[PDB]
Amino acid sequence: SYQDYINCSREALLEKMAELLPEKRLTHCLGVERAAMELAQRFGVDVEKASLAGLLHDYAKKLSDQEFLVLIDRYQLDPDLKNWGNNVWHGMVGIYKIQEDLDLHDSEILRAIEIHTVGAGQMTDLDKVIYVADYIEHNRAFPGVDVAREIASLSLNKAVAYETARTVEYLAHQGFPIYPQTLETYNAFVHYLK
Amino acid sequence: SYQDYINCSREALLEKMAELLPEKRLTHCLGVERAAMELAQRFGVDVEKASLAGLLHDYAKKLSDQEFLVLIDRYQLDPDLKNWGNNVWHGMVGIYKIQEDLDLHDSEILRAIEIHTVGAGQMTDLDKVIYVADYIEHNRAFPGVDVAREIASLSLNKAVAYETARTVEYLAHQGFPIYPQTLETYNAFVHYLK
Ligand SMILES: [Fe+3]
Ligand SMILES: [Fe+3]
Ligand SMILES: [Fe+3]
Ligand SMILES: [Fe+3]
């Protein structure tokens, strides 16, 4: 059960999350919970760790900038983090809020949430499952989601590669700064597109 | 004259380059020479340094991989360079061949050639002139070159930003590895697109 990792039941957790997140975002988290279970089954990852990590990945999405800055200082995190914003913070910093609120100490689940947005050059299969589940969950309808889903049915690594390439492409298209760890992920995984 | 920087006249140089480079590439170099002069006039950069740097920027485009690897070892350059290829090498390593062949020791011209492909987080106006001239020279006809030309008529910094964003976008679109120094340039200049 989820209580093997956190300080409350799944239902109690959902009730807490319904207070923290808008409807669309909680619906998304439920979608990632389901998608992570499916991917974990397919690729030999613990389905319970994957489900929980999926449900929790965006738990800190609505923390204020000020709250994130306080956490960077309190946990003496990479000071370069202050130069970024919610997109980077909600996973990379938000894990500390999740830990405080839920008594989540499982290193694998924490890592998968930590890097769910930006990836890393080295990712566990659990990390990859969450990173991909976030992109392909059933509520997503962006053009090309069908391609992502097809790739994810066949190769976890190729799905990471595809998502990362689309993210870098899109950020450059929009003229948004690209977190350097995102490029580490991109360069490590891009060979899978061949 | 060019002899103030290199060991031969401009005509002698053109004759040497016509032996090293295919026609299309030499035509390109002549185009960059002209475009760099125009940009240097516009943005207060020495027109002669810009012209020469522009003519020379792709001098090493046809060196073999083996030749580049030999240069990395001989000059004890960043060993990570061996993980890349001609796109990175012809500027970043090719400067040493240019120096050997032409007795080019001007630090500013060398730097502008060195980073003409990948940029840097900090670029001199001369570096920026070459980086942009390469992209907008009259023989180029890629879709969107008109936009690049318009931006370059107004802002050197915005032209660097635009070119860098299009390069990152394209590399991710194609599924090619992105040299990390390219991301340094991108992140440093992307604010100019606003
Ligand atoms: Fe997220
Ligand atoms: Fe999400
Ligand atoms: Fe070049
Ligand atoms: Fe060129």
Side-chain angles (χ1 to χ4, degrees), chain B residues 39-145:
Chain B
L39 288 168
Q41 288 194 112
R42 181 176 308 132
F43 297 114
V45 172
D46 182 323
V47 295
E48 183 173 59
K49 287 188 177 214
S51 295
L52 182 52
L55 181 60
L56 290 177
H57 80 291
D58 273 349
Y59 179 100
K61 192 67 176 96
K62 312 310 301 317
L63 305 193
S64 66
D65 295 348
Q66 286 307 134
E67 284 177 283
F68 284 121
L69 297 166
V70 170
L71 289 160
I72 289 155
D73 286 340
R74 287 183 58 230
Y75 290 89
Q76 296 202 22
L77 300 184
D78 178 13
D80 178 66
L81 290 160
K82 303 202 166 181
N83 296 321
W84 299 87
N86 184 283
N87 180 80
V88 173
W89 296 338
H90 73 281
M92 296 277 284
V93 184
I95 49 164
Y96 298 103
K97 180 67 173 183
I98 299 169
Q99 173 163 276
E100 286 174 6
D101 283 1
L102 307 177
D103 205 13
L104 179 64
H105 290 273
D106 186 83
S107 65
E108 290 170 11
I109 296 175
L110 287 161
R111 180 64 172 173
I113 298 163
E114 187 190 0
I115 65 166
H116 84 267
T117 306
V118 302
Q122 302 271 41
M123 298 178 73
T124 65
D125 292 352
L126 176 60
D127 299 333
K128 296 176 215 183
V129 163
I130 305 309
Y131 184 88
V132 172
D134 187 37
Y135 199 59
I136 69 170
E137 66 93 1
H138 82 267
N139 301 281
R140 307 295 299 268
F142 61 86
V145 69

Side-chain angles (χ1 to χ4, degrees), chain A residues 2 9 53 64 67 87 109 120 122 175 183 194:
Chain A
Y2 284 7
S9 71
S64 66
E67 284 177 283
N87 180 80
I109 296 175
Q122 302 271 41
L183 190 67
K194 296 198 83 201

Side-chain angles (χ1 to χ4, degrees), chain B residues 1-16:
Chain B
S1 69
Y2 284 7
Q3 294 106 304
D4 292 323
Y5 299 106
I6 60 170
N7 62 12
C8 63
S9 71
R10 179 174 179 276
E11 179 50 53
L13 174 63
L14 288 174
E15 286 172 44
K16 297 180 191 174

Side-chain angles (χ1 to χ4, degrees), chain A residues 84 165-166 168-169 171-173 175-178 180 183 186-187 190, chain B residues 84 165-166 168-169 171-173 175-178 180 183 186-187 190:
Chain A
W84 299 87
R166 299 292 67 73
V168 172
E169 189 180 353
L171 292 165
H173 185 88
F176 303 153
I178 297 164
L183 190 67
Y186 175 86
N187 281 336
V190 76
Chain B
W84 299 87
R166 299 292 67 73
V168 172
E169 189 180 353
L171 292 165
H173 185 88
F176 303 153
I178 297 164
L183 190 67
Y186 175 86
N187 281 336
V190 76

